[PDB]
Symmetry: C2
Subunit: 472 residues, 2 copies
């Protein structure tokens, strides 16, 4: 074959392990291996049963976001089981650091369909995959002619193993349809020259049967990219971008839902529902003229009861942000009224940056109805970790043009202003990184003693909408 040099050496390496594998399962009655009772096809093809992702366990990775002592595919799988529709496990040993023990660990840990990510050229690899708990296998059309594929697809069918059929182009697509593939793998990375072409998934999805599923891989940087690509890919395969971070659960939430805040938390159970639904950030209001005002006693009970939100201390003050800092406060949100100039805004921010020290993020909240609003936003974007842009302009209506806002500002911004289950799609369409969610998920005035409290049913609905949104 005319394989990229790296792939060439990987399949020839794998050829040279086949005697090991044959000896390793010699004692196994291949004929009597139980079938896989987990359909990767269905998990991927239905909205229910997990978000639009196959999440991958791979040992070999620089992972410079964190200090790696030991590979724990059980601990990774435990977090992935909460978000994904499948788990991928590298079984290749010599350059991915994988093994069949990793596959078995994940199969025993997770309820999801388990994919053996391997370079499969020999039936014994299919047999080993089922014995060690795989529910699906990768077959690469770049490596296998039509006969080699048909034979291995037939070994797979014996045991109800789903196949992820990798295809690089329109010719491989035609071959896959020919061979009746149900799950098409598209890599945006060309292995020959390491070029990324995000379009390769859109372009090939037009040629793929309507009763088939498309999984795409590589260059899926963030939720913004997931939303750009989610119209034509059923699922994204990701891993190293989640396991290379300090907290795999928080990383999973940030990719799937984006950097969303549920503000105005006043109860443990509200913080708990927010985190469970997919919120990354929790908002705590210190201002005492608020119906969402929380005492330092309530603040610390909420943080303690739900440690797995990143908490944001929200104040209307221009200084004294050191007083707000408590264990678990990740960021302070400057909610002070807009100042007189850009320079006063740059100064306020530097003064707060100064108060809280480099271990606490500094966010600026801005009303876009304020005539200086957009100008400050564009000016102060590099000085802050997040902008909270309030896009409900009140009685005037929306005077500001959202088409004029730079991509850099949007990438730094959570959209605010009565964000609710019903206006979520149209808020997401604006193309900001996040949503700031508060009064729009509270019970209304008719709710008796529950009026003004976070409504858990509304939290379930708005996070479901966020999980499936894509640009239309």
């Amino acid at each position: 074959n005319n394989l990229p040099t790296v792939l060439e050496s990987i399949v020839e390496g794998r050829r040279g392990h086949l005697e090991e594998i044959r000896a390793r399962i010699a004692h196994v009655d291949v004929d009597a291996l139980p079938k896989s009772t987990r359909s990767l096809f269905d998990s991927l093809n239905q909205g229910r049963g997990g978000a639009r992702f196959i999440m991958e366990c791979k040992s070999a990775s620089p992972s410079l976001g964190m200090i790696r002592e030991h590979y724990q595919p059980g601990e990774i799988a435990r977090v992935y089981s909460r978000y994904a529709s499948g788990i991928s496990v590298l079984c290749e040993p010599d350059r991915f650091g994988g093994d069949y023990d990793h596959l078995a660990t994940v199969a025993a840990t997770s309820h999801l369909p388990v994919l053996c990510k391997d370079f499969i050229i020999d039936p014994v690899q299919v047999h080993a995959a089922r014995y060690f708990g795989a529910d699906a296998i990768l077959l690469m059309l770049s490596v296998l002619d039509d006969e080699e594929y048909a034979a291995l697809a037939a070994e797979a069918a014996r045991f109800d193993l789903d196949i992820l059929t990798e295809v690089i182009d329109e010719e491989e697509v035609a071959r896959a349809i020919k061979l009746g593939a149900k799950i098409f793998g598209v890599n945006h990375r060309n292995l020959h020259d390491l070029s990324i072409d995000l379009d390769r998934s859109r372009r090939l999805s037009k040629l793929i049967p309507a009763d088939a599923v498309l999984v795409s891989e590589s260059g899926v940087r963030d939720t913004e990219t997931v939303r750009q690509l989610g119209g034509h890919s059923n699922a994204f395969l990701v891993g190293s971008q989640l396991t290379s971070q300090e907290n795999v659960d928080l990383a999973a939430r940030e990719l799937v839902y984006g950097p969303n805040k549920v503000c105005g938390l006043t109860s443990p159970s509200a913080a708990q529902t927010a985190r469970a639904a997919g919120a990354v950030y929790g908002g705590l209001i210190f201002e005492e003229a608020s119906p969402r005002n929380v005492s330092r006693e309530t603040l610390q009970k909420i943080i303690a009861a739900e440690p797995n939100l990143r908490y944001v201390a929200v104040s209307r003050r221009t200084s004294g942000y050191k007083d707000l800092l408590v264990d678990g406060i990740f960021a302070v949100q400057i909610h002070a009224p807009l100042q007189d100039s850009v320079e006063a805004e740059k100064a306020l921010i530097a003064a707060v940056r100064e108060e809280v020290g480099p271990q606490v993020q500094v966010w600026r909240a801005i009303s876009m109805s304020s005539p200086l609003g957009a100008e400050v936003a564009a000016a102060v974007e590099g000085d802050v970790d997040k902008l909270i842009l309030d896009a409900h302009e009140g009685g005037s209506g929306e005077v500001f043009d959202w088409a004029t806002v730079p991509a850099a500002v949007k990438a730094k911004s959570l959209l605010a202003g009565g964000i609710s289950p019903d206006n979520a799609a149209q808020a997401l369409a604006v193309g900001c990184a996040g949503l700031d969610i508060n009064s729009g998920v509270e019970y209304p005035a008719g709710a008796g003693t529950w009026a003004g409290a976070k409504d858990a049913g509304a939290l379930l609905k708005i996070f479901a909408t966020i999980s499936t949104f894509h640009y239309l």
Copy 2:
């Protein structure tokens, strides 16, 4: 009705919350509520998709096994999702400390069918349960006549909510068949007098249709009771016995699988597969004339790579057990040859008890082929935290009579001696609390470089058999 006094006050309390509930979901379009797409019936009725348990989240509990700061039904549900076939959530507020936020938190957290455990007398409770993520509801025949049940079962059917139909006796069974119940709830506790009658589930299971599922509750102390009752109950409902302990995951494993050890661990990936499969205990061998000998360097890498086994340091020495203790060693296993008398055995144990201090359990391993073996076992049972009884007597065959062994000894014992996937059922039938699993899950001599290493496929098989075993 002629309700126990406690139940009487609970339904009348719940009646008095109905205006609150009606106001709380007033804004909800009941008609347009999505259906539950998770069948509690199927999860319970199939072997696949989780072990034979509905695991319950309840705030109100002494829980003196541990210090309780905050109720975290998300954290509980995260652990339960790994083991169970359903999750139960108390929604009753005044004596169980429950709320609908708890139900929503669990629904957003877990992939399993979610049961609202409530005293349901009014349609609005059905409607609230679906809006806050329930997949199933409890209806109590003791509380509801045939008409009140039919009406609420019909509200349930609108939204594909499964029903757990509680029945106290043969008359309630007949009523439930009459009303076409698919899931029968039996409590072993009589609420009138607080008597436990474990037989009540066996007795009623004879009268229940063959196409229906039986769930039983109360007095399910341990795996031994699960195995005694598992022939006639499809599932057990448990909770307070898992959340009242220091580690909910370890408690779940101990109930579902029992206190099993995988001994002779030499690799991180072997320890990881053991824990994922359901092992509570991991065995580390310090003796240097062993093919399973591990250096202090390898020992500590394994512990670090799999922190969630309780590790047992295995040595053939009669003293010097302080040298074995390392962070993560939960117990030492005295594997010294049997001594000359009971008194020397009682002395060896007291001497080791002395060396390791009260924070490290002390286990005695005994060969039942040793003529003094059984006598020591029966004598030393109160002096140790675990006995490891080796029941493979070698060339003589099994000379010892296992019918003579006290229940107290068995309750303290893991059975050893080549325990393997193929002899697991017959080892479990002996009725010891646990299995000690080692050479019987290694690759055999034909396995090349893998010969003598733990076989992950064998670990998957033996733990699956352990999870479904019941006395026949």
